[PDB]
Amino acid sequence: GSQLSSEIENLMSQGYSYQDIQKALVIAQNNIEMAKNILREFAAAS
Amino acid sequence: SQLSSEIENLMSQGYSYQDIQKALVIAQNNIEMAKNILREFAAA
């Protein structure tokens, strides 16, 4: 695996939807720290 | 004026003042990017 896919798997463990994670990475221009900020502050987790 | 108009326009779409601030902070004041965050994720 890669670092990015590792990060995505960790986000899903937290309950974020795959679609939210993708959207967040696109808006963030793949800056991971930024995408994490978006998800934390605005995304639902189940 | 330019910037306050942006906040006014976002609030008129129904975004809270606090969500707008959060989205600017995360985007480092890239207003285009903040608007994307709000459109895709924020309650309006």
Curated annotation (Swiss-Prot), chain A:
It is linked to Noonan syndrome-like disorder with or without juvenile myelomonocytic leukemia: A syndrome characterized by a phenotype reminiscent of Noonan syndrome. Clinical features are highly variable, including facial dysmorphism, short neck, developmental delay, hyperextensible joints and thorax abnormalities with widely spaced nipples. The facial features consist of triangular face with hypertelorism, large low-set ears, ptosis, and flat nasal bridge. Some patients manifest cardiac defects. Some have an increased risk for certain malignancies, particularly juvenile myelomonocytic leukemia. It comes from the Eukaryota. Forms homodimers; IFT20 promotes the formation of stable homodimers. Associates with NCK via its SH3 domain. The phosphorylated C-terminus interacts with CD2AP via its second SH3 domain. Binds to UBE2L3. Interacts with adapters SLA, SLA2 and with the phosphorylated C-terminus of SH2B2. Interacts with EGFR, SYK and ZAP70 via the highly conserved Cbl-N region. Also interacts with SORBS1 and INPPL1/SHIP2. Interacts with phosphorylated LAT2. Interacts with CBLB. Interacts with ALK, AXL, BLK, FGR and FGFR2. (Microbial infection) Interacts with M.tuberculosis LpqN, which influences the balance between intrinsic antibacterial and antiviral defense. The lineage of its organism: Eukaryota, Metazoa, Chordata, Craniata, Vertebrata. E3 ubiquitin-protein ligase that acts as a negative regulator of many signaling pathways by mediating ubiquitination of cell surface receptors. Accepts ubiquitin from specific E2 ubiquitin-conjugating enzymes, and then transfers it to substrates promoting their degradation by the proteasome. Recognizes activated receptor tyrosine kinases, including KIT, FLT1, FGFR1, FGFR2, PDGFRA, PDGFRB, CSF1R, EPHA8 and KDR and mediates their ubiquitination to terminate signaling. Recognizes membrane-bound HCK, SRC and other kinases of the SRC family and mediates their ubiquitination and degradation. It is found in: Cytoplasm; Cell membrane; Cell projection, Cilium; Golgi apparatus. This is E3 ubiquitin-protein ligase CBL. Phosphorylated on tyrosine residues by ALK, EGFR, SYK, FYN and ZAP70. Phosphorylated on tyrosine residues in response to FLT1 and KIT signaling. Phosphorylated on tyrosine residues by INSR and FGR. Phosphorylated on several tyrosine residues by constitutively activated FGFR3. Phosphorylated on tyrosine residues by activated CSF1R, PDGFRA and PDGFRB. Phosphorylated on tyrosine residues by HCK. Ubiquitinated, leading to its degradation via the proteasome. Ubiquitination is negatively regulated by IFT20. Residues 3-42 form the UBA domain. This protein has one functional calcium-binding site. The RING-type zinc finger domain mediates binding to an E2 ubiquitin-conjugating enzyme.
